[model samples]
Target: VGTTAVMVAAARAAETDRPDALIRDPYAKLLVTNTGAGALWEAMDAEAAAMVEHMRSYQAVRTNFFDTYFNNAVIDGIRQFVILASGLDSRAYRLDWPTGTTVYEIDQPKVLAYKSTTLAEHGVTPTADRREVPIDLRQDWPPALRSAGFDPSARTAWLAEGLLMYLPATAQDGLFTEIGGLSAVGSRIAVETSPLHGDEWREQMQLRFRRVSDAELIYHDENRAVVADWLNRHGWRATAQSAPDEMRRVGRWGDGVPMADDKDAFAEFVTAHRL
Candidate 1:
């Protein structure tokens, strides 16, 4: 689980060095380096390098998409925030949040500890009132969040980026249910929907990323609720945008990346507001 976080931070670090980076993550490099995953960040063979490039491109687009989503939510006057499964993501430190805004980061205890310790060691502090809720999402975390001073009565902005694939179908539903129960009217949410892949595509990815990590073993590819539909049925107004479309809009889509209709190559971005 932590390895995946390091890999993603490596991708963000790579994107930060790009001449036309969609997002800038100044802390990503240090985060990955401190984890000693710098070798995993650099030692990919030709085939793996190609796959890594594709993933890096996707990460760039994903980061930019969620960054914009949170900024837009803040602009709309929502102050409280929650980032589910927030792993090595430095948004709380980077974004210029207004006063009185609190950002809650929920993740495993070790993962959260590593991040806060590493960043604090470097003399970095969060731009907002950052609170850490150290608990697994599959387990009971709502109480932990409440103890961390989360205000459920206030309108909140919630994010679930790069997190759904790790959860089983029922857990995904439960996550939304909990979020809905906590959210007040006008609360907003942004999610990156994980697209289940066919066996052939899964096998190919498994072989390609064998040196990096076990994709098939970690990902619970069981059938899951369609995010936008689920949200619409649950008292939230939701909309979705294709990954390719958003990447194109941001000028990040390029060669070697799969286009629309390729289920294994892309995911959807879903945004919603509580009704």
Candidate 2:
């Protein structure tokens, strides 16, 4: 997940040469290349490269649009935030964090280890006070985070990018509950979710990779309304963006466009604030 986003982000950053590049991590390409992600970046052709650039550019607008709120909230919490299942997100290092900011990253151990080591070897200095809390999402990670100095009073900004759908509905709820307990009033969170690409995008995804196990896909399509209600019940002002809504809002929704489907969407972005 992190690898792909970084790959996409780096690819976009490399191409187009957009002056407002969402993230400008000098160490990104180097780390990706050193970690043997050259092929993934290479898998992108001219067209696919364009799509990646589009995704990066669009997601940046979305991420940044929401983070405008996130960044403000983080300022009061001793400047703290959590990136759950962070993967290869460069926000911690690339986003201009306010002073005294502390960012905590959670992901699988090997993933964080590799990123930490590879970036360090390249002499990359993180732009923020960042800590890696490596653990599987299914484990008792909240305790681990607390042990690593998470404070409930600090009210962290949270991001769950490209992480839902992989988790069971119950697990997703549990994750939100955990965050709700830790965050203080006025904290904000942003999440990006999709009904699993399942066998669809996975095949497209698998075509770009040749490693590891568990290649099967699991699509989660249960209504997110219930979860949104739970969040509201817990004091969050929640809103969701489905494909149709997003497409129409962006004025690109053709009558038969794939993203025009209101019933099903590839992804959603939600930003909620604690009241």
Candidate 3:
């Protein structure tokens, strides 16, 4: 779980170094370095070079999409924000959120604690009211979030970035059901939908060489529902765009669709609002 954070942070840091970067994450470098796994940068370069540019592009596009989603959600008058499986995310401290916006982060206790400790040591502070609801998503998180000052009566903007695919099918369905119960009529949710090529990709991962085992890193949940459809059926007016389209829109996808071989492995960006 924390491993992917290193990968995305490394990608974000690299993106920031580019003159034509799509998104800038000033804190990404600090987060990576703080992990004492500064070796991760070189490891990715040497071991996962074939995967690096691809991962970087995907992460860049994903960041741009969600950044726009949250900004628009706030513009549409959603003041409460929740980041499910928040991990090493720095959105509360980084994004230029509205004044009354309250950002709630849900993750395991240690993950949230580590981020707080590291960021505080770097002299950084949140731009909005930030509350840490330290609880595992697999456990009862909503009650902890409520305890952390989350107001379910207010319209909320929720993010499920890089989270869904990790859950089992039943759990994934349960997560949405839980979120729906907590959400107000005008609340919105944005999720990154994992690609459909799970089995084939798992086959490839089995053949690839990695210092860290990919099997342990990823859980292929075969029974998950189609994100937009699931949301629409559950009372959200839904919309979605394929990952390739979003990547192209963000200008990160250069010169024709590049990942043809792994075309089926790219994810989509889904955003929905309750009617």
Candidate 4:
């Protein structure tokens, strides 16, 4: 489960090296190289390489979309930030946050520890106040977040990037409940939704990645929730954009990939504001 962090970091590192890079994360290389599964970040064969390439493109687009989300939220004068399941995400260190902004990163203890230690060792410092809430999202993280000085009175920008698919349906609902309870009016939330794929596609991916890593084992595809619908029902003004549409909008869509209507092939980025 933890190694997936390094895998995405590897993708970010590769994206950084691109001439047309959508986002720049200078710390991604260091984070990936420091991990034990670092070498396995490479593809084992041609088919795996194609999959890795697609993953890299998807990560680039997704990262760019969320980058804009946070930037716009900051522009809207929301200061407090929470990045749920913030795996190897270096936004606090990389993004130019305004003074007085506090960025909270919630993840497993080891995952949080590794990122902080690696970055600190490399003489990296955050541009804003960065707090690490070292706890699993499946556990009681709201109290942990509050203990870390999260203020519910302030409007916050919440990000659930690449997280929901790993959570069971019930836990996903509970996560939204906790977030809604903690949010103040005008609070903003962004989520990357992973729709379940057909059994054939799932099996194909499992077989493809078998030579590389058992990363597929971490995915919980059962009973995925409709994120934007849930947010609208919970008194939030929500909007969703298909991942392929986003990719095309950002000029990162690759040839031969199916469009957004082919739901199982891609995700949807959902953003909502508290009403």
Candidate 5:
């Protein structure tokens, strides 16, 4: 549950360090180092440099996609933003949200507590009215969010980035249903659907990384209902961007990449509106 967040934080840190970067997360490196994954972060960057490039590109494009997703939603007057499983995401502190906007982050208590204190210690202030829904995604989170001052009647911008694979299929569908129940008309949602990965790819990652395990990779089974279709069935108007297309659009598509044929290996970036 935690490793990938820190690893991605490391990726965001790497992006922040670049001359031509897609996004910035000033506290990402600090959050990562504090997690004791600093060495693993360094090892990945150094040893798995080839795959790291592809990782960075994927991260860059995914980051840009969600960034644009929220920004455009904000422009259209949606004010509430909820980031599900918002591990190590620094969007609230970095994005330039409009006045009266609120960014609600949902994650484990310890994870949120750590980031909260660490970022506060570093003297960083959120760009909007930031609220922490410090609860597990699998548990009852909607009420917790409401207690945190979330307004269900108001239009919202919800995100499920890098989160679906970690949930059971029932939980995945239930999450959207709950979100739909809370969301008012004109509300929006963005998600990074779990990439379809076979045993070979999963095994290869385990073999290469050697640190991440099968348990940590995901906790779900297949026949994954198409996210866009699922949303459409539940009173949402949806659109999807293929992962490869997004990578290419952001100039991050890998050239002569070995795993290009593995369609299941990449995710779909989706955005939907409550009807």
Candidate 6:
């Protein structure tokens, strides 16, 4: 949760904004700021310069908004994705769970362990019943998660925040398949991706003399259209988030995020039992 708070703050700091926010949440800043996500805030401010207030506003709004949408989607949970790669999100710790909310976290053991320790240090306790299942998304995490007690009979919410780009192209399909196999009625999910590809990431990194935007590199997408088609085929009623527009819905950001310039009411998929 905290990790994602920081990443979005970084993106919000970007080069410019055209301003037609599609969504609003009004609490993103509270999440990051509450944790003193100082680095992220500072960077966003510095990058935005005079537009810092806009950055701050956008962050505050969008973060809380999607958070609400995500939580609502999980109310009927039979399966869940605290997708092991998920970091500090507190979804398990914070959200009110459905009767049988079985969450699965996917990430390096260190990432998962650290958050557990840090939250304990901060004296924060989780509200939902949680089951930590550590596995790198780059590996065979699908089977690994099932072994750790994921139930396919319940509704689910598959969340991939600040993950995905780290995966190879083939791994993306594999990840979706694993989630699809487990999904039941009223399962909703949210995922974000950059328009840039791995090669584009490398080229940009070379130009900038750094590894990559990390966001653009790790969570980046190959082709959202194809990804959506895959989801539809796998029995999911899927939709993609227009990153920038999501800012407007939450009243969070400048037009720096995807589709935010259009004021079209940004949305991620709200898939459920189409049967």
- lDDT over C-alpha atoms for residue 159 of model 4: 98
Give stretches of model 4 more than 4 Å off.
42-49, 196-203, 209-222, 255-261
TM-score of each: 0.90, 0.76, 0.89, 0.90, 0.92, 0.66
Q: Give the alpha carbon lDDT tens digit for every residue of 169-250 in model 6.
A: 6777887777777776666666654343233533422343221223235544445335555677777777665545555555
Which structure is stronger by TM-score: 3 or 5? 5
Q: Rate the local accuracy (lDDT) of all candidates.
A: 0.83, 0.64, 0.78, 0.82, 0.81, 0.53
Best-to-worst lDDT order: 1, 4, 5, 3, 2, 6
Tens digit of per-residue lDDT, candidate 3, span 58-98: 78888888888888887787889999988877888888887
Name the better of 2 and 3 by lDDT: 3
Span of ten consecutive residues with least summed lDDT in model 6: 204-213
Q: Per-residue CA lDDT of candidate 1, range 157-264, in tens?
A: 999998887677788899999999999999999998877453344455556778556434355455678889999999999999988788778776655522335744
lDDT tens per residue, model 2, 2-101:
5555665455345324575643545456655665554555344443333444444555555544555555665455378888987766677667787788
Cα RMSD, each candidate: 2.9, 5.0, 3.4, 2.9, 3.2, 6.9
* Error of model 6, residue 244, in angstroms: 2.6
Question: Model 5, stretches more than 4 Å misplaced?
Answer: 45-49, 197-199, 210-216
**Which one is best on TM-score?**
5
- Pairs that collide in candidate 5 are 196-264
Model 1 stretches with alpha carbons more than 4 Å out: 45-50, 198-202, 209-222, 255-261
Error of 3 at 59 (Å): 0.5
lDDT of 1: 0.83
Q: After superposition, how far is residue 92 of candidate 2 from its true place, in Å?
A: 2.1
Deviation of model 5 at 108, angstroms: 1.2
Q: Compare the candidates by lDDT and give the number of the best one.
A: 1
Runs off by more than 4 Å, candidate 6: 1-47, 50-62, 74-81, 98-100, 196-225, 256-275
Question: The CA-based lDDT of model 3 is what?
Answer: 0.78
Which runs in model 3 stand beyond 4 Å of their true positions?
A: 42-50, 202-218, 254-263
